[PDB]
């Protein structure tokens, strides 16, 4: 009584920093699915993050634009700017710009250096413009938030035909992209009906996934901290 079961496998089966899997050894029945659902709903719905939510597009600001010779629909520009991992410090909102032209695909090096923004890879393309005498110039804006937001439950309208402002961009605040849990059947040397919790998570970047599991554990402990008996 009062002495329950604990994991023992600390052996990590790791991949590179965009994909990770952790395992658990002998946790009691009715705990693998419970903790799996808890860590899934924390690492899927409640994660403080930051992404791109407002882009000031120069030129034509309608729903269908010719993009002045990039030969790319603006939905694909908003898709390329959606999954952009940008580090954001304690400043909640910041506005930068980009000015780059010439011959070649638009990389992430067009954004100027700032004390908070840090990009770890330049291979993230944005616009494949036609190699002619043309230039692109747009402002980027990121903010801190939580969870995911739909495209329906948003602000009222376009402010009664006011195209001087910018449109709303759907953003993925949390650095997760996919998460799965596998509850396997293992055994103690006496009892034979137990579980193994295998968490497989894909991080978008700049976050150690086991450190994200540790942050999820601190969030789960923060919600039930005042319901503790002993130290």
């Amino acid at each position: 009584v009062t002495e329950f079961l604990k994991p023992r496998l600390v052996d990590i089966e790791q991949v590179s920093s965009t994909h990770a899997k952790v395992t658990l050894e002998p946790l009691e029945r009715g705990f693998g699915h419970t903790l799996g659902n808890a860590l899934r709903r924390i690492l899927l719905s409640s994660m403080p993050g930051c992404a791109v939510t407002e882009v000031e597009i120069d030129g034509v600001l309608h729903e269908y634009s010719t993009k002045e010779g990039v030969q790319e629909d603006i939905l694909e520009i908003l898709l390329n700017l959606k999954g952009l991992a940008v580090r954001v410090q304690g400043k909640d909102e910041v506005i930068l710009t980009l000015n780059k032209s010439g011959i070649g695909p638009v990389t992430a090096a067009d954004i100027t250096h700032d004390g908070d923004v840090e990009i770890v890879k330049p291979q993230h393309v944005i616009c494949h413009l036609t190699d002619e005498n043309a230039s692109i110039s747009m402002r980027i804006k990121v903010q801190r938030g939580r969870g995911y937001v739909p495209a329906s439950t948003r602000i009222h309208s376009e402010e009664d035909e006011r195209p001087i402002g910018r449109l709303l961009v759907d953003a993925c605040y949390s650095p997760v992209e996919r998460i799965a849990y596998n509850v396997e059947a293992a055994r103690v040397e006496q009892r034979t009906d137990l579980d193994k919790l295998v968490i497989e998570m894909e991080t978008n970047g700049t976050i150690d996934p086991e450190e994200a599991i540790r942050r999820a554990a601190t969030i789960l402990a923060e919600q039930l901290e005042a319901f503790v008996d002993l130290r």
Binding site: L44, L78, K82, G83, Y148, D170, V176, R178
Partner: peptide, 14 residues
């Protein structure tokens, strides 16, 4: 308008 595609995460959340 999604990337990844990762269409299961918004099915799972809301």
């Amino acid at each position: 308008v999604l990337t990844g595609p990762k269409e299961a995460e918004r099915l799972y959340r809301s």
